[PDB]
C-alpha cells in the first residue's frame, strides 16, 4: 500500500506542532497556507508517483544514473540532512508523547522511543501490519475528532473566511508559514513516492502505466483532501481555543489536548498523546526506511539500518540535553525541510518532462509549468524568510 504507509508522514508530530502553534498564535490567518501547501503536495506527489510508474526507477536512482558524480554526492548529502530533520520532529514527537502519558523526563522519553524504534525496525512486514492499522486507527479518529470539533467550536466565520486570503503578519508569520509548507511538502516523501510506485506494473505496457497513473491520482487527491481538511480543522480549532485568550503556553503541544476537551472531555489528554505517540513512532520508522532507500538510490550502497537509526537519534538527545522546547524544535525542523523542497523539485520537474524517461507518459506542459511556479513560490518564501532572519 504505497499511499497508506506514507500517509502517516502527512500527520506526523510536525503537522501537529505547526497546526496548533499557527492557530493559537495567528488565529485563522494561515489557513491559506495549509490549503496552498496541500494543493502543491497534490501536484508534486502526483509527479513523483508518475515518475516511478512511467520510468520504473525512483528519483534518487535516476539522479545517480544520469547526473555527474559531484552533483549526485551533493544531492545525497542534502537529502541526508533532510532525513535527519524529518526524524528529529518525529522522534522527539514520540518522546514528548511519552511525557504526556507517563510523565517521564524527555531524556527517558527518548530512551523509550529509542528502544521501541530499534525494536520496530527488526520486525518483518507481516508483524507490523497490525501495528500500522492500529496507529492508523488512533490518528484517523483524532483527525475526525477535529473535523467534528471545528463545527462544535463555532468558529468566527468572518475570521475563517479572511484566513483564506493570502496574508502575512510579521516576520514570525513567514517562519511558521514555511514550517507549514515543509510539514506537507515533505522532501523525503518526494523521493519516497517514486520508489513506492516503481515495480507496481503488471505487463510493462503503456496501457497498464496510464491505469496506475489514473488510480494513483484518485488515491492521492482523496487522501490529500482528507489530510488537508484535518490540518485546517486542527488549526481552526486551535485558533478558536487559544487565539485571543491569554493562555500561558498556548500553541505548545503539552496543552494542545485542550482543543478537544469540550468534545472528548477528560479523555482528550490521553487520546491526543496516544495519537501523537503513534504518529511519531510510525513516521519515524517510515522515515528510517525511506532514508535507507534514498541513500541506496543516490549512492548504490547503504549503511547498516542500526547505524542510520543511531545517527538520527543524536540530534534528538542533544536537543533534550540543551533543554530546548520540543514543540519549538518540531517547528524548526519543518522549516529546514521546506528548504530542501526546491532541490527535490528541480530533477522531478526535469525528469517528468523528458520522453526518454517517461515514454508516452510525459507530463502535460501545463502541469510542468504549474510545477515550476510552485518551485519559484517556495524559493521566494525561503528567500523572504532567510532575508528577514538576517536583517532588514
Ligand atoms: C468540516 C471541516 C471543514 C474544515 C475547513 C477549515 C475550517 C473552516 C470550517 C468552518 C465550519 C464551521 C461551521 C460551524 C458553524 C458555523 C457557525 C454558524 O454559522 O452559526 C452557528 C451559531 O453560532 C450556533 O448558534
Ligand atoms: C491521512 C494521514 C494518515 C492517516 C492514516 C490513514 C491513511 C488514509 C489514506 C487512505 C485510507 C486507506 C485506503 C486504502 C486503499 C488505498 C490503497
Ligand atoms: C548527515 C550526512 C550529510 C552531511 C555529512 C556529509 C556526508 C559525507 O560523507 O560527505 C561525503 C564525504 O566527502 C565523504 O568523505
Ligand atoms: C499503558 C498504561 C498507561 C501508560 C503509562 C502508565 C501511566 C502511569 C505512570 C505515570 C504515573 C504518574 C501519572 O499518573 O501520569 C500522569 C502524567 O503526569 C500525565 O502527564
Ligand atoms: C544517548 C545517551 C546515553 C544513553 C544512556 C541511557 C542508557 C539507558 C539504558 C537502559 C535504561 C532504559 C530505561 C527506560 C527504557 C525502559 C525499557
Ligand atoms: C474517513 C474520514 C472521512 C471523514 C470522516 C467522516 C466523519 C465526520 C465527517 C467529517 C466532517 C465533520 C462534520 C461534523 C458535523 C457534525 O458533527 O455535526 C454536529 C452538529 O453541528 C451538532 O451536533
Ligand atoms: C465571495 C465572497 C463571499 C465571502 C466574502 C467574505 C464576506 C465576510 O465578511 O464573511 C462572510 C462569511 O462569514 C465568510 O465565509
Ligand atoms: C487545470 C485543471 C486540471 C484539473 C484536474 C487535472 C487532474 C487530471 C489531469 C491529468 C492529465 C490527463 C493527461 O493527459 O495525462 C494523464 C494520463 O493520460 C492519464 O490521465
Ligand atoms: C478537490 C480536493 C479538495 C481540495 C484539497 C484540499 C482539501 C479541502 C481544502 C479546502 C476546502 C475548501 C476551502 C476553500 C476556501 C473556501 C473559503 C473561501 O474561499 O471563501 C472565503 C472568502 O473568499 C473570504 O473573503
Ligand atoms: C558517529 C555517529 C555515531 C557512530 C555510531 C557507531 C557506533 C555506535 C555504537 C554501536 C553499538 C551498536 C552495535 C550494533 C551491532
Ligand atoms: C545543524 C545545527 C545548526 C545550528 C544549531 C545552532 C544554532 C542555533 C539555532 C537553532 C534555532 C533555535 O532553536 O534557537 C532559537 C534561537 O532564536 C536561535 O538563536
Ligand atoms: C535554490 C534553487 C533551487 C535548487 C536549484 C539546484 C537544484 C538543482 C541544480 C542541479 C542542476 C541540474 C542539472 C540538469 C541536467
Ligand atoms: C527573476 C526571478 C525569477 C524569475 C521567475 C522564475 C524563473 C526561474 C525559475 C525557474 C526557471 C525555469 C526552469 C526551466 C527549465 C525547464 C526547461 C527544460 O530544460 O526542459 C526540462 C527537460 O525535461 C530537462 O531535460
Ligand atoms: C499552486 C497550487 C497548484 C494547485 C493545482 C491543483 C491542480 C492539481 C490537481 C491534480 C494533480 C494533477 C496531476 C499532476 C500532473 C500529472 C498528470 C500528467 O500530466 O500526466 C501525464 C502523463 O500522461 C501521465 O504520466
Ligand atoms: C490553480 C492554478 C491557478 C491558475 C493561475 C496560476 C498561474 C500558474 C501558471 C500557469 C498555469 C498553467 C497554464 C500554463 C500555460 C502555458 C503552458 C502550456 O500549457 O502550454 C501548452 C499548451 O497546451 C499549448 O497550447
Ligand atoms: C509568481 C511566480 C511566477 C513565475 C512565472 C514564470 C516562471 C516560472 C514558469 C516558467 C517555467 C519554465 C519551464 C516551462 O515552462 O516548461 C519547461 C519544459 O521543459 C518545456 O517543455
Ligand atoms: C534562498 C532560497 C533557496 C531555496 C532553498 C534552498 C536551501 C538553502 C540551503 C540551505 C538552507 C540552510 C538550512 C541548513 C540547516 C540549518 C540548521 C539550523
Ligand atoms: Cl480575529
Ligand atoms: Na513543549
Residue numbers in the entry: 45 to 436
Verbatim from the authors:
In addition to the physiological substrates Fe2+ and Mn2+, Nramps can also transport toxic metals like Cd2+ and Hg2+ but exclude the abundant alkaline earth metals like Mg2+ and Ca2+.
To compare the metal-bound states to analogous metal-free states of the transport cycle, we determined two metal-free occluded structures of wildtype DraNramp at a higher resolution than the previously reported G45R structure, which we refer to as WT (2.38 Å) and WTsoak (2.36 Å). In contrast, metal-free WT has a more ordered orthosteric site, suggesting a stable occluded intermediate in the switch from inward- to outward-open. Interestingly, both metal-free and Mn2+-bound WT DraNramp crystallized in the occluded conformation, whereas the open conformations were achieved through conformation-locking or mutations of functionally important residues. Overall, our DraNramp structures suggest that the occluded state is most stable (at least in the absence of a membrane potential).
